[PDB]
Design a protein around this ligand. Sequence first.
Ligand SMILES: *[C@@H]1O[C@H](CO)[C@@H](O[C@@H]2O[C@H](CO)[C@@H](O)[C@H](O)[C@H]2NC(C)=O)[C@H](O)[C@H]1NC(C)=O
Ligand SMILES: *[C@@H]1O[C@H](CO)[C@@H](O[C@@H]2O[C@H](CO)[C@@H](O)[C@H](O)[C@H]2NC(C)=O)[C@H](O)[C@H]1NC(C)=O
Ligand code: NAG
Length: 592
Amino acid sequence: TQVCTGTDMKLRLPASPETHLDMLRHLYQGCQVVQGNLELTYVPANASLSFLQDIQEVQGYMLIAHNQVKRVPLQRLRIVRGTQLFEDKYALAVLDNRDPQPEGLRELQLRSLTEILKGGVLIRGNPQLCYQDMVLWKDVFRKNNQLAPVDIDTNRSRACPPCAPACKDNHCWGESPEDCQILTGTICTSGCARCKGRLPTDCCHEQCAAGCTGPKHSDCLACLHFNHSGICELHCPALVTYESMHNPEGRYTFGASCVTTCPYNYLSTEVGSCTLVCPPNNQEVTAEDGTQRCEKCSKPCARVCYGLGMEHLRGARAITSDNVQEFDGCKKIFGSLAFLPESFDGDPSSGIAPLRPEQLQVFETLEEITGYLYISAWPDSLRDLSVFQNLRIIRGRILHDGAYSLTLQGLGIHSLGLRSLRELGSGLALIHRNAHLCFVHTVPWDQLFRNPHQALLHSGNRPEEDCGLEGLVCNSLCAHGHCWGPGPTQCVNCSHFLRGQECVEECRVWKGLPREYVSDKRCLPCHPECQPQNSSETCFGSEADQCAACAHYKDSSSCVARCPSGVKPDLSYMPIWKYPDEEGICQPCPIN
Ligand SMILES: *[C@@H]1O[C@H](CO)[C@@H](O[C@@H]2O[C@H](CO)[C@@H](O)[C@H](O)[C@H]2NC(C)=O)[C@H](O)[C@H]1NC(C)=O
Ligand SMILES: *[C@@H]1O[C@H](CO)[C@@H](O[C@@H]2O[C@H](CO)[C@@H](O)[C@H](O)[C@H]2NC(C)=O)[C@H](O)[C@H]1NC(C)=O
Ligand SMILES: *[C@@H]1O[C@H](CO)[C@@H](O)[C@H](O)[C@H]1NC(C)=O
């Protein structure tokens, strides 16, 4: 697309360096607006970072830390809004880009960045870096962001070449005549916050953010608040106008844009904003057909199951013996599930018992997670993720490290067993360091994804061709070779009939055990009082009334194990007394 979602990993090491770059690539390739924080970290010496080259806007902060690359190609980046700040104060943080000694970041080259709405700048520990002190920062910082901290270290093990002669003022982002700083704040006339030149004819509209092509609200380089189809405006048009009526111009706010409709995986509020999370004392209602909306509860909200990151589990790290039981009977969890080594080791200092595999069945009910699933430890006695057999959707409205809606890491599992998983609402799946794990590639991951930024990243599992030579392959009854584990329960779809959750070639219509009838490709058992037929069907439905014939006795039209002796109909005093015919037909007893 063009709008994408950033991350939230701060300075923490990537779990998967073998995969980190792929991740950055899948998140940012083609992306123009990052909603969230743009965090580029631990990029090695030779990485290609060219998938960053379309980024024109960061809504949160931008963090460039712990890389060895010499160049970070962000020359189209126009604005960092700073709706979130690093260390709660910096819109731009460039940290520790060096090697343990020549490598390390050399120039920032942010030659399009003409706007920082909120927060300041931190540049520290970057020993090859030049030109960090030749930016006029206060031109960059919005007029009312002028007191933003500038904490810019210039300790260097190299000599900086000057700003190229062609630079009209002595300001630049780098040594080349292309990296000249373009000034759009400090050079303006009067009460003009942003301009394209020194004259008032060059003033930008007040609703523009980084600069302009001309004077109009259709000529902005970026919108200060909201882009309403090519016009920057203070507000999106209301959904309702005042008698009060519906407004056919109505728009929803999504980021710095006015949208006709909320994007996938988002909820609509009455006031027409889009959220990942409802305001307090709301409920999520699924319009019958796809939509979800936030609606305030007139009386007390129905009791709901909160997972990690949410309400009283806001600060909780992991599912544990002290908390598993809060999930009994839960179909929907608002929040996330994470199972870490601590979950299964316990902690003898708090007295926390290790989580027993049996306790995990409290999840057999689970159909939906609004946040993420993160599994970093799992019992060795559980060969698969079968306790989540009925899990249908991981929404990924909250994501681990702000990137992953499904993580399985360093586990001993042999198969997945996630047999109901049909949807990863957003975020990436990361499945790595599971040395005995097969049936990863038998899953049709493209079918669970919902945007083109999502992918499965994988490494260190069992090679697929090594599984495929040991008979760990999809059962042959699974349609299209798609399955989640070995055997006939693990199909994504059955090509034939299902008996319970087992895929079978045939129902027991003529042959078999207890006899069966068919209904919607489903093997269903005849009543136990039906007599199995040697030649024909044994039943045509489930009830005692629906047998070819009775194994024991018959009462009116249904096959029965015993004749009624003294059975009283609901609201009657008169009991029925019967006895079986010589041919097994229940007849009325001659006495009451
Ligand atoms: C990144 O680039 C450099 C430069 O090509 C790599 O260093 C080279 O290593 C190869 C392989 O042995 C040598 O043949 C070159 O002569 C080296 N060049 C240098 C720096 O003098 C470096 O290994 C690369 N780093 C990564 C992350 O692979
Ligand atoms: C505001 O958003 C509009 C989208 O409505 C952007 O304008 C479109 O940009 C695409 C790709 O850049 C063009 O192909 C279309 O011709 C444009 N359409 C419209 C509605 O003008 C626009 O760039 C954004 N403006 C700002 C200031 O960010
Ligand atoms: C950079 O140099 C000065 C003076 O030599 C020193 O006091 C300062 O602490 C250094 N910066 C860092 C990385 O601490």
